[PDB]
Amino acid sequence: MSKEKILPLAARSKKAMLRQPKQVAYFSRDLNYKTHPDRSNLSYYYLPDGDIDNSIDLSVGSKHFLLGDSVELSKLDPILLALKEIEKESGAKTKDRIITWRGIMRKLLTLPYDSEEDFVLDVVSFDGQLFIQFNVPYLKSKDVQKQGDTEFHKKLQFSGYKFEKMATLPKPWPECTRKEIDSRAKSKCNNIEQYGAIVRTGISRIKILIGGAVACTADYYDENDPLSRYIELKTTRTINQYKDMIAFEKKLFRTWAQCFLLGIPKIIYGFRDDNCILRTVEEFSTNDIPLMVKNNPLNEQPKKENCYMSSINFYGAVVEWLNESVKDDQVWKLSYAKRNRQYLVLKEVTDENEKQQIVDSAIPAWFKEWRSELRNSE
Amino acid sequence: EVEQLLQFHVATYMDNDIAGQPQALQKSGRPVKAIRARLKGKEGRLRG
């Protein structure tokens, strides 16, 4: 009989203290989904104050927007490549337990308070380590639902990506030329090329190796503490009413969770109107946001329970449950249903064909023989 | 790690509002009234 586990949504970790995360590897996914351990795709933030006054529209070039394959980008190939590299360099097996992306863990952290999206994830246990990623059939169903999205939503997504293009540079500012700066308005936008950081972090007794998509860095790259100079960008509709603050702080919670996962110290928003025109640009601190929301003068006491600490406790409880429940060489599924919003359901996978397909999607063959020869050496 | 667990227990017992880490929450969800807050604030004894 198949084994099913139910975790109450009210689960909160008592001691979800965060060890300071350290970037142990870095990668740059190319247009062909190939991973190279370099910082070629790392961007550098640059956005002067006076640029806002130009009233730049965020819809120039939306008709030729590019989108990568969701299945291809959901694979854990870069993380496994970095793990193989660090294993070959060290020669000893790492103590890390959980392997994941930033978006998956942001969904797992913001689930109680961002309950308007549905997702299914697959977990594969191999060599005592758990690799989690998206579920391919559900991802295909998501794409099926996606092509029914109106061109307004596509224009909004392209506006966000165009804001990211305009607020970044492909090189450090002293090494950039004028042409690389003023041609960002005509630059083609795609979701394929991106830069990532492979960072070790600690929650309670669990070491998690996260691959976080870094938008850009502050002004340079620090080889000692790479996390301290990282910066990301976001777009949000402007504010004119109380519901506007409510929606903006709901989005702020999600973005703060995303930055807290990868240790981004600073957050930047660009404000857009109904015409997708950039209105304001604001900056916030990751450690100041929990205090900033509670100390607002318009609504001093919205709730007596702090949502951010509860979110962190729920994240820690989810991490601990994932580590404890999953055993060795087991393939499991974690699907969150927004129709229920009551508990998390964890299921086992018994179909050998589907299990092997999920493993191949997560663990490529070449990494399998690399771990096989590592085991033979062991 | 178990020693740090005991340390966190005594820390939450003595101090409630600890920066960067969750406070001890009762079964009803309210924070545990640490002895540090027993003498500070309106609920504190020093104000009266």
Partner: peptide
């Protein structure tokens, strides 16, 4: 430098633990 010729490690507060950097 101390008053012993030994370099003084820097103590950093991670969570509630203290880590030394020699």
């Amino acid at each position: 430098v101390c008053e012993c010729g030994n370099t003084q490690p820097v103590v950093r507060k991670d969570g509630m633990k203290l880590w030394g950097t020699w």
